[PDB]
Design a protein around this ligand. Sequence first.
Ligand SMILES: NC(=O)c1ccc[n+]([C@@H]2O[C@H](COP(=O)([O-])OP(=O)(O)OC[C@H]3O[C@@H](n4cnc5c(N)ncnc54)[C@H](O)[C@@H]3O)[C@@H](O)[C@H]2O)c1
Ligand SMILES: NC(=O)c1ccc[n+]([C@@H]2O[C@H](COP(=O)([O-])OP(=O)(O)OC[C@H]3O[C@@H](n4cnc5c(N)ncnc54)[C@H](O)[C@@H]3O)[C@@H](O)[C@H]2O)c1
Ligand SMILES: Oc1cc(Cl)ccc1Oc1ccc(Cl)cc1Cl
Ligand SMILES: Oc1cc(Cl)ccc1Oc1ccc(Cl)cc1Cl
Lengths: 60, 60, 229, 229
Amino acid sequence: YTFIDYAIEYSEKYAPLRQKLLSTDIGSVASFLLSRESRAITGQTIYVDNGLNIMFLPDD
Amino acid sequence: YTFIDYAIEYSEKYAPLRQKLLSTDIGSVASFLLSRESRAITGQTIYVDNGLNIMFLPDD
Amino acid sequence: EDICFIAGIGDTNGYGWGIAKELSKRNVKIIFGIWPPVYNIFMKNYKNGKFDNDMIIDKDKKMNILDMLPFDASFDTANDIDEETKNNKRYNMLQNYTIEDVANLIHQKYGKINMLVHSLANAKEVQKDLLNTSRKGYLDALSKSSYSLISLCKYFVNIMKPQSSIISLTYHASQKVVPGYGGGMSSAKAALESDTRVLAYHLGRNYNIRINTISAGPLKSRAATAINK
Amino acid sequence: EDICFIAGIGDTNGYGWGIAKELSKRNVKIIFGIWPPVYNIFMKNYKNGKFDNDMIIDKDKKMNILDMLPFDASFDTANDIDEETKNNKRYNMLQNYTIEDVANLIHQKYGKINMLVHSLANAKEVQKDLLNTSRKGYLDALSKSSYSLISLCKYFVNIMKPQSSIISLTYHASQKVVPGYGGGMSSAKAALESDTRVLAYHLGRNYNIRINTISAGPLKSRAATAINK
Ligand SMILES: NC(=O)c1ccc[n+]([C@@H]2O[C@H](COP(=O)([O-])OP(=O)(O)OC[C@H]3O[C@@H](n4cnc5c(N)ncnc54)[C@H](O)[C@@H]3O)[C@@H](O)[C@H]2O)c1
Ligand SMILES: NC(=O)c1ccc[n+]([C@@H]2O[C@H](COP(=O)([O-])OP(=O)(O)OC[C@H]3O[C@@H](n4cnc5c(N)ncnc54)[C@H](O)[C@@H]3O)[C@@H](O)[C@H]2O)c1
Ligand SMILES: Oc1cc(Cl)ccc1Oc1ccc(Cl)cc1Cl
Ligand SMILES: Oc1cc(Cl)ccc1Oc1ccc(Cl)cc1Cl
C-alpha cells in the first residue's frame, strides 16, 4: 500500500522510540545545527529517525 | 611529549575547523541532546571534534 | 540578524516547512526557494490564506517569511537554461531562477546570509529499481539531488558570513538497501553524504563555514507519495 | 523544572564542567557526583572560592549547583564495597556513595530528575598498550568506564521522568586506532558505544527514555595528562 506508508508503519512499530516523527522534529535539529551552538560539528550525517537506524532484527 | 599535547596540536592543524576545542563546545551540544529539542535522536554517537574524524590523509 | 535561505519548499507537508517553522521560533528571517513548476500555485495558495493556520508559531506568533523566490536547482547560471524550458509554460513569466541568479538576487535585496538549507531532491526514474535505471535517469538524480548541493555552496558562499552554516537532508537508503528507493536516489544520497564530508573540509578551511546533513526518518510528504512501490 | 545529575567531576578542567556550565545557561539544576578520592579536595577549593571565576556564565550568571555528593561508579550497591575501601582514609567519613544509594538519595531529596550525564572513565593500565594489558587491568577499564553506564541506567531509570535524556562521552579510538590510548580504554569505548545502541532500545521501548553518546575531540583535562605516552 505505497512505499511511504510501509516505511512509516514500520518505523512506528520497530524504532526504539515509538512515536510519530513530525517534520518539526527534524526542524529543531536543523535549527540547532544551523546555530552557533554547534560550532564544533561539521561534515557529519546526524540521524533523526527515532533511532530506527540502530536496529538489525525487528521484534516481530 | 605527552599524548594529549600531540592530539590537540594535530587536531588544530588538520581538522576542517581550525579553532581550539573548548569544553563548553561539547557542553552546548550536550545541552541540546539532553533537552526535548532532540526528541527524535537516540542510540547515536555524535562527533563534536571540529570534524577531525572525517579526515583520512593529512595535508602536509 | 539571521537570514536563512531554504531551497526546496513546495507546500507545508514537507521537511522544508518543518525547518522554516522551527527557525522562525528563534526569529530568523526566512527566504523560500520554490521550484518554478509549482511557484504560481504556491503563491496562489499563500495569497488565499491556505497556509494561515500552518504559519502560527507555538509561542503565539506569525511565521515571518522575508521573501519567496522561484528557484531551480538544475540550472547553475543563465546560460545553462535550455530553449525547451526557456519557453516552457511555467518558466516564461519568471526570471532569475538559476542558482547564481537567486544568489545575486538575495544579495542585492537583503545583503549577506548565514544559514543555508538544501531540502530538495528529484529523479526521473525513481519508480524503477537501480538495475533498470537508464544512464540519463541516473545522472538526472545525481544532478538534481547531489550536485545541486555543491553548486549551491559554490555560489552562495560568496554572500555568506564567516561561521555561517549549511545543512541538507539525506536518507539511510544510501548505507543500507531499501527496495523501492530506486532511480538512482540511493546513489545520489550516498554521494550527498560523501560530498558533505569533502565540502566540510574545503568550506571549513577556506571560509570557516560548517556543513552537515540530516538523515531523516519517513514523513508522508508530496514527494514521498510519488514513490510508487 | 530540569534536574541534571553529572557523574564525573573532579575539577573545572574537564568536560563535566563545560557541560554543567552550558546546562546552567538554560537554568537546569545541577547535581555533582564526585569521586571520593578527590571529594574533599574539591569541596576545599570550592569553599575557599577557587572556582568562583569558573562559575561565571557570560550573561553575568552564576552557575547554580544544587548539591554535591560523593559518588563511586565501581560500586552498584552498598554491599558491593569491600572492607578495604570501606575503611580507607578517603572513604571512612563518607556514606551513600554507591550507584544505588545516590539514586535513592537524589530521589529522596529532590524527587525525580530528567537528565543524566555519564562523564567518567578509568583504567589502571592506561599506560600499557593493549597487547601488554593484563586481564585484571582490562576488566578494570571496562568495569569503571563501560559497565558503570549500564548500572547508572538500571538504578536511575526509576527516578527519571518519561522523555528524560541520558548522555555519556566517548572517543574515536574505539573506531580507528590511536597508539597511546591503552589499558583497554579503546575496548571500553567500543563497548560503551555499542551498549549505547542496545540501551537506547530497552530504555526507549520501556521507559520512553533517550540515550546518546558524544565522541569528543582532544581536551587537556586532568585525566588526559595521565596518559603518559
Ligand atoms: N519525506 C521523507 O520521508 C524523507 C526522508 C529522508 C530524507 N528526505 C529528504 O528531505 C528532502 C525534502 O523532501 P520532502 O520529503 O520534505 O519532500 P518535499 O516534496 O516537500 O520537498 C522536495 C522539494 O524539492 C523541489 N524540487 C524538485 N526538483 C527541484 C529543482 N530542480 N529545483 C528546486 N526544487 C526542486 C520540489 O518542489 C519539492 O518541494 C529531500 O532531500 C528528501 O530526500 C525526506
Ligand atoms: N579530555 C578529552 O580530551 C576527552 C576526549 C574524548 C572523550 N573524553 C571522555 O570525557 C569523559 C570525562 O573525561 P575528562 O577528559 O573531562 O576528564 P576528567 O578527568 O575531568 O573527568 C573524569 C572524571 O571521572 C572520575 N572518576 C574516575 N573513576 C571514577 C569512579 N570509579 N567513579 C566516579 N568517578 C570516577 C574522576 O574523578 C574524574 O573527575 C571520559 O569519559 C572521557 O573518556 C575525554
Ligand atoms: O529521500 C526520501 C526518503 C523517503 Cl523515505 C521518502 C521521500 C524522500 O524524498 C524523495 C524521493 C524521491 C524523489 Cl524523486 C524526490 C524526493 Cl524529495
Ligand atoms: O577518553 C579520553 C580521550 C582523550 Cl583523547 C583524552 C582523555 C580521555 O579520558 C581518559 C583516558 C584515560 C583514563 Cl584512565 C580516564 C579518562 Cl577520563
